[PDB]
Amino acid sequence: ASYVVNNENIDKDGRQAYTGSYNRAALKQMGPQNREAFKEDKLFKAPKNKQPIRKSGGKQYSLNDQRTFTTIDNRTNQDEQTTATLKYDGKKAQVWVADQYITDKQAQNIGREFDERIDPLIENNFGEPSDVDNNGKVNILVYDIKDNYDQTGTYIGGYFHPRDLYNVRGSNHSEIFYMDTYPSMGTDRQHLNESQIYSTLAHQYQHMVNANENLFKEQSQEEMDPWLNEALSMASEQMYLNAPLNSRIDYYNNSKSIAYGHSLIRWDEQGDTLSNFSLSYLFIEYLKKQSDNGEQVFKELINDPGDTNTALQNAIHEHVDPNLSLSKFMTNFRIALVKKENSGPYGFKGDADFNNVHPQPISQIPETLAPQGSVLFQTNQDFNVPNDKDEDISYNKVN
C-alpha cells in the first residue's frame, strides 16, 4: 500500500522527531521549467524596539524629487543606501525609481496598476495599510534588488520590512515595499517587462497591510508566523491573476527537499526557501477550497486577534469542521495533495487548478521529521508502523 507520514506537532520551533525503526518493505521508486519557479522574496521580522515615528502634513515629495532610501543587500544581509526619483505620484502609490534602466512609462504603469487594481484588491480582501508618515500614500521603490541570482539562478522579486514603520536604524519612516527590476522583469536589462511583476505588487502589499492589522490595529501586537504570512501573499497573487501559481506547483513537483520531508511551518531561511513557498501556497489554496466562505476566510485569518495557530483553528471550526483540530487538518492537507478527491478533506473539491500536483514517493523514511514535515512512500508488504516512533509521528494508510 501507500503511507503518508507526518509530524503532527504544530509548534514550528519543535524538535525533529524520530520516525521509528521500520522494515524496508518499501518500493524503490523532470526539472522545474519556468525560471519564475526560482523566484523568492523576503519578509523580515518586526523589531522588538517599536519606537514610534513622530511627525507634525506630508507634502514633502513630488514628481522628480530625489530621496535616498535604506535598502537591503540580500547577498550579505547588510543595509545599503539607494537614491531614487519619484516618477509616479498617484492616488495611493508613489513609485520611486533607482534603476537607470527603468523608463518613466514603466513607473507610471506600475503606479496605475497599483492605484486601479492592486490596492482595492488587497484592501477589500486582506487588510489596509498604516500611515506612519500621514501622507495618505505608500512608497513602491523599484530598483535592482541585490541577491545571489548571478551565482544561483534564484532571485528576489521584492521584499517588505516592518522596521520601516518604526523609528529604528535602517527605517525609512514610511509605508514602503521594494520591487525588483532585473531579473524579475526579464533577463535582458534593456528589455524589461514591468507587467511581469504586477502580481508581486499584490504579494508585497499583503505583507504591508498584514503588518498594519496585527501590529497597529490589534492590541496584542503579535506578528503572524512567516509561513502563513507568505501563504496569504501568494493567495493574493492568485486572486490578482485569477489563475493558479503554476510555477509554485511546478516547483513542488520537482522538489527533492519536499519529497524528503520539508516543513510546512518552519521557514528554512538558510536552506531551500522555494520549497516553503510551494508548501505555503498549496496550503492556503487547500484552506480556500475547504472553507465554506472560500476566499473570504483570508481576511478572517488576519482579523483574528489570537496568534497564528489560534487564528487557523478558529477558521477551521467556523468554516470547515467544528470538531477538526488544526494538527489533523494539516495531515489532511498532505493526504489531499496525494488523493485530490473531488470532495471531502482529501482533496481540493475537484478544483481543476490543482490536478497537476503530484507528490513524489520515496524509498526510505528520513530518520527524523521536522514539525509538519511529511513524506510519502509505498509498500510491497503489509508493513507495520514502528512501535518506537515519536508520538507526534502519524503513519496514515492511503492506498
Cβ proximity to Ca ion, 204 vs 214, nearer residue:
214
Distances (CA, A) of 273 to 38, 83, 85, 277: 10, 30, 32, 7
CA-only gyration radius of the chain, Å: 22
Min separation Cβ 71 and Zn ion, Å? 16
Residue span binding Ca ion (CB under 5 A) among the ranges 71-79, 167-175, 348-356, 357-365: 167-175
CA gap 326, 323 in Å, rounded: 10
Residue 175 interacts, among Ca ion, Zn ion, none and using kind-specific CB cut-offs from 5 to 8 Å, with: Ca ion
Scan residues 116-155 and list those touching Zn ion (CB under 5 A): none
Residue 250 interacts, among Ca ion, Zn ion, none and using kind-specific CB cut-offs from 5 to 8 Å, with: none
144 binds Ca ion (CB under 5 A): yes
237 binds Zn ion (CB under 5 A): no
| C-beta separation of 38 from 274 below 8 A | yes
Give the three cell numbers for residue 364: 526510505
Scan residues 30-49 and list those touching Zn ion (CB under 5 A): 41, 43
3-state secondary structure of 167: coil
Give the three cell numbers for residue 318: 467556523
Residue 2 burial (CB count, 10 A): 15
Cβ proximity to Ca ion, 41 vs 175, nearer residue:
175
Binding test (CB under 5 A) with Ca ion, winner from 180, 225, 230, 390: 180
40 binds Ca ion (CB under 5 A): no
Cβ proximity to Zn ion, 19 vs 184, nearer residue:
184
Burial class (CB in 10 A: 0-12, 13-18, 19+), 195: exposed
194 binds Ca ion (CB under 5 A): no
Binding test (CB under 5 A) with Zn ion, winner from 71, 94, 125, 233: 233
Residue 362 interacts, among Zn ion, Ca ion, none and using kind-specific CB cut-offs from 5 to 8 Å, with: none
Residue count, binding to Zn ion (CB under 5 A): 4
- The 112-131 site mask, x for binding Ca ion (CB under 5 A), equals -------------------x
Cβ proximity to Zn ion, 9 vs 229, nearer residue:
229
Report the half-sphere exposure of 31 (CA within 13 A, side-chain side).
3
Q: Which amino acid is present at 22?
A: Y
CA gap 335, 345 in Å, rounded: 8
Residue 144 interacts, among Ca ion, Zn ion, none and using kind-specific CB cut-offs from 5 to 8 Å, with: Ca ion
Give the three cell numbers for residue 338: 496525494
315 binds Ca ion (CB under 5 A): no
3-state secondary structure of 359: coil
273 binds Zn ion (CB under 5 A): no
3-state secondary structure of 211: helix
Strand ranges (DSSP E) for the chain? Answer: 2-7, 17-18, 39-43, 66-73, 78-89, 93-97, 138-143, 155-160, 176-180, 368-369, 374-378, 393-397
135 binds Ca ion (CB under 5 A): yes
211 binds Ca ion (CB under 5 A): no
Cβ proximity to Ca ion, 192 vs 365, nearer residue:
192
φ, ψ at 235 (rounded to 5°): -55, -40
Residue count, binding to Ca ion (CB under 5 A): 9
Among candidate residues 346, 251, 366, the one with its CA nearest the CA of residue 290 = 346
Contacts of 151 by beta carbon, 8 Å cutoff, 6+ apart: none
Give the three cell numbers for residue 212: 498594519
| C-beta separation of 10 from 326 below 8 A | yes
Cβ proximity to Zn ion, 278 vs 313, nearer residue:
278
Cβ proximity to Zn ion, 41 vs 113, nearer residue:
41
Cβ proximity to Ca ion, 249 vs 311, nearer residue:
311
List contacts with Zn ion (CB under 5 A).
41, 43, 230, 233
List contacts with Ca ion (CB under 5 A).
131, 133, 135, 144-145, 175, 180, 214, 304
